[PDB]
Subunit: 333 residues, 4 copies
């Protein structure tokens, strides 16, 4: 029997501190999306959260780099709770918290909220992919930035959802490299919509959204990678042609790394080079990172991904120093 | 946030009848048989791109009904009764979302009107098909639907695969808007399995549902960068379907990216399909045709029985096309 | 079983401009009687219980002409009782068992009740009922111009709570053995704001915060002995004033005041008429159990005849209203 | 914005131990009601719970007597969360937990469940008055015995509620002494009913109850006390005449004590004397007891009632020893 959002909000109300961090971080990101600040947003963390203990440890380490680079980078943790599978598979912590096919969703949602509250309370803002239609009411108030995945960008119900989120939202290009669907998606999500959704009390209702002003595109690769300068420039021209923001984000992972975690660094280096030469259209990057590098099918090793392979903590330090140094130069112009 | 009546309210005013229930049951089975190769009739999903007027749709049904009966040994005719439309950016999302066509978004009326029409259609002997786009609306009218599509833009979406996994009707997954067929094959795999996810009950309250899987899914070739209707394309698709361990019987959409911005090309496509059915065409179990009383399209709903969404062929062309397919499939069935 | 929420019935049967206006008006007009601003006599009259809408519509049609005829002396409002409190067990009314066969088709019952109430208000006839259940009122309350809380539930806090949140005037009946203080206590209670659990138009439980009902009053319905007469009214008015609440009250001609003998309602009416002639300043209303055809029956075989408490018939009803109208015309002249 | 029962059941699931205690205690009480065991049920504790700390402390002390006297008495704590007022007033911990007019009902219901779980976990079963229609779904699973109050015994919605409780239920005679309404009530509650109620998920629904076979009456005084032998005998005769159990419970407090806390001991002494002589129709008693005696308007003194005045802990030890000694003799005859 599903507990409604209000049950979880009662046990874990948002705090003054978390509320302020979310509010502030959303604004700060808005400023990047609309070209009012030239810091580089960095969405970085695990492909998926499967352990909260490890995620809290990861956050603790990342928090120090968030503070150290705060003049060059705006660091936000990937705290992904919902995973889109190619066919079937584990859909994430909310759907299957115990990782055993028991689908204890009430526990999952509790655990997700708790972790998010803790993260915000320690000073680390959170980001996630919004995949399910009904789960967001549980934890959305604790999210500073949202992704709509490559597999759902073209979907109208996801564009509808985005249109009503209070956080900035990144739409990824399609799994074969279609960028126009993400540009279309900003157009869609920036408008007001009417559709069916569920309330904080667990009942279905008609909602009227005001539109999300702060959407942007994410280059995640397709058949071929789309990260490089030619690709960014091409994208920016298409964005301007559609009358939407020409500031975009580049995913170092996934189709841009050809599903090879050791290539995220190459992509980061290419981005760094663009930031040095010009790179005026770049406002963010995305990196799949964890305590320990690689991936594993069963959750045997602590702080190691059970979804997409991540770079480890050492490589993570390198990468952030690389980007911070490069962006400091861009901001000096 | 505005008041929404739960499904049970609409089920109370418009309960399914013995007859509609039996037609739905029977038609789902009949389609299952096509999907799994037990019957060589050709499913034909045919009707408007979208329903915007119930009067016209009832009239269209009246005429189509006679052909459904006339061709029942060769074709299994089912009407397109599409209530939910996926836009490229923004636009009118269909009768449920905006029944009045004026931006009033009177969804309670929409859902009532949709159920009423569907009940009337089934009652007169015409089965109905629609695209399932929204997650929460299906509980309102799903019991009146004999076949469902998941659109090109949502086939890759996991929530749509989940929804499909719990529908009691056969379901067609369309290839992607640029021609990706693997996403539809992946989608059958997904939807055929059991899933656990959040959904809303007949009473309007969110809940965890545990679906049993949908064994009757299949692929639809709707074009992409290049059309995928012809024999080479069908054969390539059947090989990929067999490789994935799912049914190699598929459906071909004559409309959309296969007709490539001419409604009248649907006839060319139908002719090509007819030729395949004559030569061999063993992998084809269905086709899809965008048809209305009057041909073409219009931005405003000024002309009766003319589409306000994608352009359709008219009634005359519709008669030609069905006779063509019937004649051709009679031959395939004789071998 | 799957209960439809109030909004489902409100969608099919929205209140009309006309019904809405009649309800609003009639509640005000009654308020005026309760607080002594108008000397017309409220008359709550109709069947003990509604078991057939056809008959009730026919009854209303006839009563409507007397309501118009006597509108300067009487304010006539129909008893349209959907919920019945049993001594032990029994048929609890149309909402609970509409088919009268123990099928308990409550969704139908509530639909039928609302439909009837809408039709009644639409034709010009205001409606009254006893509010017994906690959750049913959300379905039809908007169509009710006056409400009773029964003798068996007046002392109950959940009924006082419910009353506190009704937008219509409410009569509290004295207890089944004649206790009047519980009804006076009940006005105190219901006049204040309350917080308690209730169900929304959407069918979900919720905390409600009521504003209080300023239009409550007492009803004398008999006990071990009848309490209708002048000595009893005077005694009651003194107790009401002592508690700081309205000393205008209503007298039930039926039930314990008639000693469960329908032919005595007329005696009681005559005694009330005499009081209205002599003085009767504390009386603002009466209650009469009336139908098309007099008496009662266990099974619903005869049309327009009660299956609950025995009622007077249409002829006697015409007599009684003329009696009260004539008597009250005199009181108003003073 | 009201949380549904499932939210509280998720945070505070019933334990194996509490579940077993409830199950067992309900059976043991059933046995008393139907004359299969001659122990004396004792419902004892505060008039109302306003502080959980004090209630847990009270329980701790009572638990030792429950164990000491377990062969003669079956002791169960009064843990009353809902209070019926004469007019207006504080309605109990659930309605206003903070005691300040903030009506924080979500907190109240949480606190009530938590306290009840703790009580059952330590070995102390709980009893309460069921007043509200929607609150029971929150805490009912933790209750071993239920009362329907003097003010609501005649009410059909309370008889309906009772008909679906899994615990034995005592119906009190009316505030002026009417016993027949309680006998009628057992008749009613023992039958199946159909009515509207709210689910564990917080949505309204139609419920079909199976009937409660374990109801009995409670003598709690009226205009005059009804505790004595003549009154018991007279009640038993009426009970037998109605075909329901002639084993009853006697409240030492309220009308019987004449609203005087000191008086309860007298009543207990009279009951003890009946148990010695014969007292075959008595299965239970009710006592209003707390740490400290008397009452107070504001919650200034710890463990002292803010509702009806209670006897203190000392007097409580005296009373239980009195009843235990007396009932040991009754049980020896057999
Ligand atoms: C899988 C997902 O990215 P996508 O494949 O949607 O680009 C993710 O962010 O890990
Ligand atoms: C729009 C939809 O088709 P799709 O573009 O998903 O093939 C339809 O059938 O009208
Ligand atoms: C039963 C009820 O009267 P009461 O007994 O509450 O005075 C009625 O008016 O039918
Ligand atoms: C007040 C209530 O009992 P009653 O007055 O119903 O006998 C109680 O037990 O506190
Ligand atoms: Mn990933
Ligand atoms: Mn179309
Ligand atoms: Mn009556
Ligand atoms: Mn008390």
């Amino acid at each position: 029997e599903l507990l409604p959002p209000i049950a979880h909000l009662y046990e874990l109300p948002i705090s003054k501190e978390a509320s302020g961090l979310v509010h502030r971080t959303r604004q700060e990101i808005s400023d990047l999306v609309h070209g009012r600040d030239k810091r580089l947003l960095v969405i970085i963390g695990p492909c998926s959260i499967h352990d909260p203990k490890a995620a809290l440890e990861y956050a603790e380490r990342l928090l120090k780099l968030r503070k150290q680079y705060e003049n060059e980078l705006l660091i936000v943790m990937r705290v992904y709770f919902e995973k889109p599978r190619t066919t079937v598979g584990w859909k994430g912590l909310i759907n299957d918290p115990h990782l055993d096919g028991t689908f204890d969703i009430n526990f999952g949602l509790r655990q997700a909220r708790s972790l998010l509250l803790s993260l915000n309370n320690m000073g680390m803002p959170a980001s996630t992919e919004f995949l399910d239609m009904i789960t967001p009411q549980y934890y959305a108030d604790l999210i500073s930035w949202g992704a709509i995945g490559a597999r759902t960008t073209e979907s109208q119900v996801h564009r509808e959802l985005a249109s009503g989120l209070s956080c900035p939202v990144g739409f990824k290009n399609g799994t074969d490299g279609n960028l126009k669907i993400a540009i279309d998606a900003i157009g869609a999500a920036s408008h007001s919509h009417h559709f069916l959704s569920v309330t904080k009390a667990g009942h279905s209702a008609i909602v009227h959204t005001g539109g999300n002003p702060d959407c942007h595109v994410i280059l995640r690769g397709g058949k071929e990678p789309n990260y490089d300068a030619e690709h960014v420039s091409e994208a920016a021209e298409q964005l301007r042609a559609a009358g939407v923001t020409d500031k975009l984000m580049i995913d170092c992972s996934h189709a841009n790394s050809r599903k090879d975690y050791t290539r995220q660094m190459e992509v980061a280096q290419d981005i760094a080079a663009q930031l040095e030469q010009d790179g005026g259209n770049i406002m963010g990057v995305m990196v799949e990172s964890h305590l320990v590098e690689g991936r594993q099918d069963k959750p045997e090793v602590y702080g190691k991904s059970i979804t997409d392979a991540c770079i480890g903590w050492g490589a993570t330090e390198e990468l952030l120093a690389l980007l911070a140094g490069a962006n400091k130069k861009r901001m000096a112009r």
